[PDB]
Structure formats: C-alpha cells, structure tokens
Amino acid sequence: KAAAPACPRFDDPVHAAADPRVDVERITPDPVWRTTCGTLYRSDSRGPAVVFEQGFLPKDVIDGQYDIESYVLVNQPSPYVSTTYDHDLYKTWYKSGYNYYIDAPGGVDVNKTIGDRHKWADQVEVAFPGGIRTEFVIGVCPVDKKTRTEKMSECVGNPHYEPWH
Numbered sequence: 001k002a003a004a005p006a007c008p009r010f011d012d013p014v015h016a017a018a019d020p021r022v023d024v025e026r027i028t029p030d031p032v033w034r035t036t037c038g039t040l041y042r043s044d045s046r047g048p049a050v051v052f053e054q055g056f057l058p059k060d061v062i063d064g065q066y067d068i069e070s071y072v073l074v075n076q077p078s079p080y081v082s083t084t085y086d087h088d089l090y091k092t093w094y095k096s097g098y099n100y101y102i103d104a105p106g107g108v109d110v111n112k113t114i115g116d117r118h119k120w121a122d123q124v125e126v127a128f129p130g131g132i133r134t135e136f137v138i139g140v141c142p143v144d145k146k147t148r149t150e151k152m153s154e155c156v157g158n159p160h161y162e163p164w165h
C-alpha cells in the first residue's frame, strides 16, 4: 500500500481554460476553487472526434451568465463548462451519449461556493470558467441509453491527453 501525494497548485486559477477571455473578476459569488486533482466527469452528447479536437469550449464567455447559482438553477449560455465529481452522474442524463473523463486543475467547486442546500447539490458540480483544453480530457466512454451503463469496450483515450501529476 501507498498513500497518495498532494496536488500541484497552478498560479492561474483558469490555467485549464480553453477560452482564456473568461473574466474571473465577474464570477459571482466569490468562487471557492477546487484544489484536488481527482478524475472529473462530464456528460456530453458530442462525439470524441469533436471534443478531442476542440476541448470543452464554453458557450458564451463574453455575455453569458457569470452567476453560478443562476447558471446551476437555469441552464443558460455561460462562461462555464460543467463537470462533476460523480462518475455515475451520467445515469441521470436523458440520452447524453458519452461520459467524458477529465484530469484538469482548478474549476469552481459549486457546492463549496453556493452551499450544498440548493436543488441540484446532488450533482456535486465543478464549473470550469473558460472551459477545458483537450490536453486535460483523458478520454470517454459511450453510454448505452437503454441500461444507463458505459460501453466499456468502446471507451476511447484522447491522444491529446497530457498527464501533469
């Protein structure tokens, strides 16, 4: 047995951003940044050919919804790409198609930022302002709609993944 080490700390809180035009000063409320470095996950209907090329780009870093709770409660175009601590959250999506695996520094820990009492605290979300570059996307597993399970013989690793810890 070995105990795990601690995580590297990047000076830039949006070091992972695919779109660095994100304005961290406009995040509300004041963000509590994730300091751990475990695998995160994201349900996305887009195929790996798309995501592995572009990374996870946010829908509107300029004029989007910068308020976390507003974005959590009412999904609308925002500077954030949503991820979860929960490997199994894909089972709650309607035909989300893929469960992406992410190894990225930072992100805003939603429940630490807005509390764990809101309606969707159960999503244990980490919101990445500016999105996530492809080098931090590990890979993906397709989801079988009927059983809400991963098709594990069809998982694919991202050739652009660059381990950093």
Ligand SMILES: NC(=O)C1=CN([C@@H]2O[C@H](COP(=O)(O)OP(=O)(O)OC[C@H]3O[C@@H](n4cnc5c(N)ncnc54)[C@H](O)[C@@H]3O)[C@@H](O)[C@H]2O)C=CC1
Pocket: 041, 042, 043, 044, 045, 046, 056, 057, 058, 059, 071, 072, 073, 074, 075, 081, 082, 083, 084, 089, 120, 123, 124, 125, 126
């Ligand atoms: N998706 C997840 O695994 C998680 C989502 N959430 C919550 O769910 C809601 C967000 O769910 P999402 O489906 O992530 O909304 P989202 O708008 O990020 O993605 C919705 C769909 O839009 C498309 N899409 C996303 N970004 C795009 C882009 N840059 N260009 C083109 N098409 C794009 C994809 O088909 C994606 O499945 C928020 O309220 C958030 O709190 C929280 C935890 C993780």
